[PDB]
Design a protein around this ligand. Structure first.
Ligand code: NA
Ligand code: NA
Length: 101
């Protein structure tokens, strides 16, 4: 539920990054930044908060075969339907370590 702006000042945005100077519980101020690239997305030209983790609206996640993520997920109509996504689309082996591409 946020409300940072109420107890912060000198807020600015540069690219995807918010910086602000915010009141500590016990009197001081601290300047910090948050990168909004992980929490906001462009949907057809409108900035939207990114949905909560898919694990909150999906169940029975499994690996199907060698690279498919399979689950049942809630539609906006609140019904569960079967869905799958090929993790080979974007998950790479970078020298022994799994990395998102
Ligand atoms: Na500071
Ligand atoms: Na700081």
């Amino acid at each position: 539920l946020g409300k940072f702006s109420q107890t912060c000042y000198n807020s600015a945005i540069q690219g995807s990054v918010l910086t602000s100077t915010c009141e500590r519980t016990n009197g001081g101020y601290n300047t910090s930044s948050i990168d909004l690239n992980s929490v906001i997305e462009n949907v057809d030209g409108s900035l939207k908060w990114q949905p909560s983790n898919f694990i909150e609206t999906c169940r029975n996640t499994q690996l199907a075969g060698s690279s498919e993520l399979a689950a049942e997920c809630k539609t906006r109509a609140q019904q569960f339907v079967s869905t799958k996504i090929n993790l080979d689309d974007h998950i790479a082996n970078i020298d022994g370590t799994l990395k998102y591409e």
